[PDB]
Amino acid sequence: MSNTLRPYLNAVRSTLTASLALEEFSSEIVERQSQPEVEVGRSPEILLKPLVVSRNEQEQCLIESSVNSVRFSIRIKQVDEIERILVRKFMQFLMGRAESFFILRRKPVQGYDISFLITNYHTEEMLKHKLVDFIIEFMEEVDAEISEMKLFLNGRARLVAETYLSCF
Amino acid sequence: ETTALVCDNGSGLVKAGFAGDDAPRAVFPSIVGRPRHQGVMVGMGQKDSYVGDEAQSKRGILTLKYPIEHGIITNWDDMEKIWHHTFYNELRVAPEEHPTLLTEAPLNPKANREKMTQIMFETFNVPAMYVAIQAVLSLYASGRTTGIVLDSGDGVTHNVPIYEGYALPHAIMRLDLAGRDLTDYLMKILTERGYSFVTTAEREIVRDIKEKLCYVALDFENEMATAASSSSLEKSYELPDGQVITIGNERFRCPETLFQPSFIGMESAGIHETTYNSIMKCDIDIRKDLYANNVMSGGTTMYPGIADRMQKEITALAPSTMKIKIIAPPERKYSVWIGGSILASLSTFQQMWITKQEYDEAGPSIVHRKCF
Amino acid sequence: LMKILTERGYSFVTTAEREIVRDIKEKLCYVALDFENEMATAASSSSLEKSYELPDGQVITIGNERFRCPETLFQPSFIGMESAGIHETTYNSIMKCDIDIRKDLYANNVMSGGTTMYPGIADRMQKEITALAPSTMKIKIIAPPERKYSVWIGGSILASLSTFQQMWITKQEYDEAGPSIVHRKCF
Amino acid sequence: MLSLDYNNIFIYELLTERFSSENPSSIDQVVTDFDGVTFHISTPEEKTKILISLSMKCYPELVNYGTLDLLKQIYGAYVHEPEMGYNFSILIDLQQLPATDEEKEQLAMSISMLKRNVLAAPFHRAFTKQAELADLARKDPENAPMLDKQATSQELMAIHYRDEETIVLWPEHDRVTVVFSTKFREETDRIFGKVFLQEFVDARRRPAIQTAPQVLFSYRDPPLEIRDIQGIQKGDDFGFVTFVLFERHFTPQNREDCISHIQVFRNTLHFHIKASKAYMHQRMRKRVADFQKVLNRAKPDVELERKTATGRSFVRA
Amino acid sequence: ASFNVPIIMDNGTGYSKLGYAGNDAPSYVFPTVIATRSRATEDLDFFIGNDALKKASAGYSLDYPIRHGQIENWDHMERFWQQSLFKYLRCEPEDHYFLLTEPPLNPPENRENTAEIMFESFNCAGLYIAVQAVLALAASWTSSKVTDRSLTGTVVDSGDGVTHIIPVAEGYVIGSSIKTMPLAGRDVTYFVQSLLRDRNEPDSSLKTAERIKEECCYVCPDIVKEFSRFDREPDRYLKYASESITGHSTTIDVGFERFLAPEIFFNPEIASSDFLTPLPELVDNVVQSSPIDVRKGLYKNIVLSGGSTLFKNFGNRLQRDLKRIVDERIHRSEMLSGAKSGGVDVNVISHKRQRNAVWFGGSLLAQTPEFGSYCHTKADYEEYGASIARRYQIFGNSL
Ligand SMILES: Nc1ncnc2c1ncn2[C@@H]1O[C@H](COP(=O)(O)OP(=O)(O)O)[C@@H](O)[C@H]1O
Ligand SMILES: Nc1ncnc2c1ncn2[C@@H]1O[C@H](COP(=O)(O)OP(=O)(O)O)[C@@H](O)[C@H]1O
Ligand SMILES: [Mg+2]
Ligand SMILES: [Mg+2]
Incomplete structure (x- = not known):
């Protein structure tokens, strides 16, 4: 969790809080319309350069910013394939309820497992000095959950094995 | 690698931290x-x-x-939960980035060791791990190389004589009387004065009572005779309920269960007779040195005056021509940890780990043929 | 039983109604062979309902409370105790004994005391101890019909013995040993 | 549910309904079971006559093992010549059933329990051989090892009921050891089955359940006695769980339950893997809810006026 | 090679009808309800169907996963499927092909979730999703030997949770004409329960209302004339024997409900204000919105479906109302123009498989060899992701 992820976590925090200087901006190709500019990528003069934060080859933090919208996709550790399946299913459930989260994408960008997307409106109404707090909190708690759920798998396997075998 | 993890997953208390440190970063009851x-x-x-x-x-x-009973883990779910707690909630370090050191009592079932190694390797994916005995750790901590070690803890009490750099596995004596049995006996004998303790909370309260009040006498008969004139021996304790209880001859009676195991209805030698038999089982040429080096370790050996009484009994048992000396450092509560950290912070120890690449190519039985 | 009688609609507060509830438990309460199936059967309250006549002449009816309160013996958590049932405590006491003395402990269980007179308690205890104990050997329960006064019968038998007279605590011993003679004389 | 059922529930319910009924009706339904076994129910000849058929890929090996006689003395005179496309067939007419209700119920249960009833022939044969060797060894203790070896050689029996499963069973003077050649395709199934099998081994070890038969599992290598047996690949991806059934585990009062249990083992393991998947689903959603709780910060307090129920404030003030 | 027989699932609002392809009847027709608590872990202590119904007061709390045809809670649905498959149906998922059905007008999200549950929790060989109707058209024709398929008509599928009026012309389903009324057997069951409530009957359990429909209710021409007939005729006053749990011979005196309940279909104002168009008028609108050339085929063949269309005189009244409305429109056109016409006839058709027409149509369809090619293979799912079945096809055009 922490006491363990200081430099990576603080680098992500600083980069995210620096990249969240959004602004209301309409569409330069369609009139009377405004769209998240990071997702469309049609006007390159307002798209800041993509930025990547990493701690190890299996952990990355792609930070793509724009004038109004910021997309922030991360990779979390999957040491063994058990954690691979657990991470995939858990993060699918996480993104399946993006309606009540307001900063999630229903489908992550390829080569990743989750992609946040903070449009202007979220910074407009929701005070954003704890969106990053939620970000880092999730980035550590997710590994916590994966470990706990694999423990629960082992426990249930033990219980069912005992229940089956005792009734000879 | 900067530092290596190390965890003393004892029966009653668990000690964890980093190798080379001189203070437990995390100690919590194994509950x-x-x-x-x-x-x-x-x-x-x-x-x-x-x-x-x-x-x-x-x-x-x-x-x-308690997941661990008499030194053998019986609830692997709770043991995994406790290890997860140590890894994430208090030490909060990723297991996959730190080799770990574990501790297991001697003469335990091989199932315990194999299952622990497999769990650490697969469920936590540690880089490397090692399993060590408490007595070797006590010798490492004390700075000695020769001397029988008495390791009395919450779950089990064992003796492992070790000459200069060599251990005699055939002279290892293990006794299943420990702090939990002492607490149970204290609960049983506190009923004769009226106070009743039943639930697990009451068990913890009685454990605190034994912490704060229990002590070992010098002569049992003389102490009982003195307690007959119950004038200047009783004490008082404050329960969280606010009621004050008085303690009497049972303040020192229950520690004597170590020296007279017949109190709890088990036919076995006391913690002095077992040590004497363990020394006598060794070679004759090394007894003259093992007598001079009696090592006290573990939480249970923290009773006031236990060392003096044990020295008296061992001197009575042994011939008078050769002196008997017993040693107990004031920090013997964490002697096992100190030895573990000293061992883990040794250059010559770097090649005695069990790496994951070594483990997955030989199965979980590798721990038996490498660790011990 | 007094606590659970309130939900039906009957209130029994002071000592007189406490003795009344005790008398009710004498004649109505019984121990079911199994708990969940009997609780399910209580829905079809046909053969379970019973009527009792209070001293005031008011008739009361009782349903699942007939076997709900005697079950507390096997499930001490109902009254808020973190203890084991009677069968579990008996099994633990047997297990704490020596290895070769469990033959007679399993083959000889003495059912004594007034509370052990419930209808069907012996069968339930036998089934539970059979379930916990290994199936290799047999479990027997000895339940004499006069087990209510078994303690007194045994006391009379012991007092009538021709070797017990040497073990009496005469007043002569007490006149010099104080009141502590009983500690080291009896047991 | 924790334990899988031991027979086909549909057959049991259908038989009970048609036996307790007064007006039978023509039926033609083919029903599949676990492990590829398929059952067919039809009434071709008479409305009161019901024919039930069994399909199994390994049935000829059962015939080789001597299952026809066991089926005959199990099902009495009910035996009928097999139908096309099926292995074992039975024809039942409602006009000859016993009047007593318990006989009808036990007949329905027995017919519904046809799967293990036909699959238990090797187990019965192994038990008879075990009794023979037990009495022969009791005749002279000094004659044990050579007869034990010759029984391990000659009486070594095997069967292939799935293409990734195998039972290898052989008797002895005191035990009847059985080997399962488990293997799971559908990668995630094997992924969870690794943990399931590892935990299943440990179980026996625990002193809590020492009364159970001894288990022995070691992947990437088969036991000594079955490397030369045909059909056993040299540890490609197949595990090998071995149960050692001693004399006490098949006492004359516990043979049938043990047979059914050891038969249903693999299906129980599969179903419980699926149940573990569901357990993940529910826990994972249950505390991604906690993550949503953690997120629900960063929302300044706002007030909704009424939003009473199934409507919009139901009032203008 | 020779595949195993396909499995015909069916998850209705009230009843779920499992079974196999080629069978002459569903193997199981049991309510779509799961019992659940709130030393077996709480993960597995669940019962479904009749077992759940009997085990209701033993310590479980029932819950219906499906309402109005759309699934709300997913734990209940997945547990229902696993219990069915591994307890009653007794099949291994990896060696069979499934034919799921679900009502139209569902969100694509529900279909995506169903597909991902089926191909991840179970991962069967193949999954095919069909629209509750269609199968109704397939099962409409009885003597389907080689040629006598109508292939053009209207299916009025009225069930427990929601009713659907779907026109079909030469096989293809015209999406733009699809319309759905959110009233079905459950709403009229609640109405019957309320009618028992107002009369203060000794027993008013919902199962009592269901049985009261089962052997009591029938459709009537009009409400005021039926009320007058009930006042005059005294033998239409029945007393249904309840025997709920212990109330032996507690007869329930039924009344005007017997004709007041079925009238909701032809007068939907009674149920609620969410809908106000009577069923024959709505069917007329559906047929008129259809292309002109297929109106004759739509009117000629009307197929009833579901268990809620088994009311006596339901089809007669529906046909009478539709025929009257179409005659009114045709005559209006005639006096507007001044010429006679041959007119159009209406034949509302009921058959021997009304209750489970959807299941029977699915079973008849699955036996066709070409059905296998239409299924979603597992390789396609693992390649194109979990959104392979989200493009909704029958109603409306994508993009
Ligand atoms: N000062 C003390 N006096 C008496 N008993 C003690 C004292 N300190 C610890 N204990 C007993 O020793 C036990 C500590 O066990 P511990 O030595 O941690 O076991 P392990 O060596 O297996 O980790 C406690 O349960 C406690 O009852
Ligand atoms: N004989 C009947 N007459 C009228 N309504 C019925 C009759 N039988 C059942 N119903 C009701 O009609 C519903 C439709 O049955 P079914 O098609 O199986 O349900 P679902 O629409 O949930 O798939 C039943 O659930 C029930 O509420
Ligand atoms: Mg220790
Ligand atoms: Mg329906």
Whole structure:
């Protein structure tokens, strides 16, 4: 969790809080319309350069910013394939309820497992000095959950094995 | 690698930290407790299970179960929960980035060792791990190389004589009387004065009573005769309920169970006779040195005046021509940890790990043929 | 039983109604062979309902409370105790004994005391101890019909013995040993 | 549910309904079971006559093992010549059933329990051989090892009921050891089955359940006695769980339950893997809810006026 | 090679009808309800169907996963499927092909979730999703030997949770004409329960209302004339024997409900204000919105479906109302123009498989060899992701 992820976590925090200087901006190709500019990528003069934060080859933090919208996709550790399946299913459930989260994408960008997307409106109404707090909190708690759920798998396997075998 | 993990997963208490440090970063009771009521409240963050210090603090509405019984883990689910707690909630370091050192009592079933190694390698994916005996750790901590070690803890008491750099596995004596049995006997003999302790919370309270009041006398008959004129021996304790209880001859009676195991109805030698037999089982040429080096270790050996009485009994048993000396450092409560850290911070120890690449190519039986 | 009688609609507060409830438990309460199935059967309250006549002449009816309160013996958590049932405590006491003395402990269980007179308690205890104990050997329960006064019968038998007279605590011993003679004389 | 059922529930319910009924009706339904076994129910000849058929890929090996006689003395005179496309067939007419209700119920249960009833022939044969060797060894203790070896050689029996499963069973003077050649395709199934099998081994070890038959599992290598047996690949991806059934485990009062249990083992393991998947689903959603709780910060307090129920404030003030 | 027989699932609002392809009847027709608590872990202590119904007061709390045809809670649905498959149906998922059905007008999200549950929790060989109707058209024709398929008509599928009026012309389903009324057997069951409530009958359990429909209710021409007939005729006053749990011979005196309940279909104002168009008028609108050339085929063949269309005189009244409305429109056109016409006839058709027409149509369809090619293979799912079945096809055009 922490006491363990200081430099990576603080680098992500600083980069995210620096990249969240959004602004209301309409569409330069369609009139009377405004769209998240990071997702469309049609006007390159307002798209800041993509930025990547990493701690190890299996952990990355792609930070793509724009004038109004910021997309922030991360990779979390999957040491063994058990954690691979657990991470995939858990993060699918996480993104399946993006309606009540307001900063999630229903489908992550390829080569990743989750992609946040903070449009202007979220910074407009929701005070954003704890969106990053939620970000880092999730980035550590997710590994916590994966470990706990694999423990629960082992426990249930033990219980069912005992229940089956005792009734000879 | 900068530092290596090390965890003393003892039966009653668990000690964890980094190799080379001189202070336990994390010590919490090895307790996993589940609620036993309804919770008509709303919210409150209903947590399914509380482990460690949280369970010790909220024992009012919880039932506590020790995963390790008599040094053998019996609830692997609770053991995994405790290891997860140590890794994430208190030390909060990723297991996959730190080799770990574990401790297991001698003469335990091989199933315990194999299962522990497999769990650490697969469920936690540690880089490397090692399993060591308590007596070797005690010798490492004390700075000695020769001397029989008495390791009395919460779960089991064992003796492992070790000459200069060599251990005699055939002279290892293991006794299943320990702090938990002493606490149970104290609970049983506190009933004769009226006070009754039943639930696990009462068991922890009695453990605190034994912590703060129990001590070992010098001569049992003389101490009982003195207690007959019960004038200047009784003490008082304050329960959390606020009621004050008085303690008497049972203040020192229950520590004597170590020296007279017949008190709890078990036919075995005391912690002095077992040491004498363990020394006599060794070669004759090394007894003259093992007598001079008696090592006290573990939490149970923290009773006041236990060392003096044990020295008296061993001197009585042994011939008078050769002197008997017993040693007990004031920090012997964490002697096992100190030895473990000293061993883990040794350059010559770097090639004695068990790496994952070594483990997966030989199965979980590799621990038997490498660790010990 | 007094606590659970309130939900039906009958209130029994002071000592007189406490003795009344005790008399009710004498004649109505019984121990079911199994708990969940009997609780399910209580829905079809046909053969379970019973009527009792209070001293005031008011008739009361009782349903699942007939076997709900005697079950507390096997489930001490009902009254808020973190202890084991009678069968579990008996099994633990047997297990704590020596290895070769469990033959007679399993083959000889003495059912004594007034509370052990419930209809069907012996069968339930036998089934539970059979379930916990290994199935290799047999479990027997000895339940004499006069087990209510078994303690007194045994006391009379012991007092009538021709070797017990040497073990009496005469007043002569007490006149010099104080009141502590009983500690080291009896047991 | 924790334990899988031991027979086909549909057959049991259908038989009970048609036996307790007064007006039978023509039926033609083919029903599949676990492990590829298929059952066919039809009434071709008479409305009161019901024919039930069994399909199994390994049935000829059962015939080789001597299952026809066991089926005959199990099902009495009910035996009928097999139908096309099926292995074992039975024809039942409602006009000859016993009047007593318990006989009808036990007949329905027995017919519904046809799967293990036909699959238990090797187990019965192994038990008879075990009794023979037990009495022969009791005749002279000094004659044990050579007869034990010759029984391990000659009486070594095997069967292939799935293409990734195998039972290898052989008797002895005191035990009847059985080997399962478990293997799971559908990668995630094997992924969870690794943990399931590892935990299943440990179980026996625990002193809590020492009364159970001894288990022995070691992947990437088969036991000594079955490397030369045809059909056993040299540890490609196949595990090998071995149960050692001693004399006490098949006492004359516990043979049938043990047979059914050891038969249903693999299906129980599969179903419980699926149940574990569901357990993940529910826990994972249950506390991604907690993550949503953690997120629900960063929302300044706002007030909704009424939003009473199934409507919009139901009032203008 | 020779595949195993396909499995015909069916998850209705009230009843779920499992079974196999080629069978002459569903193997199981049991309510779509799961019992659940709130030393087996709480993960597995669940019962479904009749077992759940009997085990209701033993410590479980029932819950219906499906309402109005759309699944709300997913734990209940997945547990229902696993219990069915591994307890009653007794099949291994990896060696069979499934034919799921679900009502139209469902969100694509529900279909995506169903597909991902089926191909991840179970991962069967193949999954095919069909629209509750269609199968109704397939099962409409009885003597389907080689040629006598109508292939053009209207299916009025009225069930427990929601009713659907779907026109079909030469096989293809015209999406733009699809319309759905959110009233079905459950709403009229609640109405019957309320009618028992107002009369203060000794027993008013919902199962009592269901049985009261089962052997009591029938459709009537009009409400005021039926009320007058009930006042005059005294033998239409029945007393249904309840025997709920212990109330032996507690007869329930039924009344005007017997004709007041079925009238909701032809007068939907009674149920609620969410809908106000009577069923024959709505069917007329559906047929008129259809292309002109297929109106004759739509009117000629009307197929009833579901268990809620088994009311006596339901089809007669529906046909009478539709025929009257179409005659009114045709005559209006005639006096507007001044010429006679041959007119159009209406034949509302009921058959011997009304209750489970959807299941029977699915079973008849699955036996066709070409059905296998239409299924979603597991390789396609693992390649194109979990959104392979989200493009909704029958109603409306994508993009
Ligand atoms: N000062 C003390 N006086 C008496 N008993 C003590 C004292 N300190 C610890 N103990 C007993 O020793 C036990 C500590 O066990 P511990 O030595 O941690 O076991 P392990 O060596 O297996 O880790 C406690 O349960 C406690 O009852
Ligand atoms: N004989 C009947 N007459 C009228 N309504 C019925 C009759 N039988 C059942 N119903 C009701 O009609 C519903 C439709 O049955 P079915 O098609 O199986 O349900 P679903 O629409 O949930 O798939 C039943 O659930 C029930 O509420
Ligand atoms: Mg220790
Ligand atoms: Mg329906």
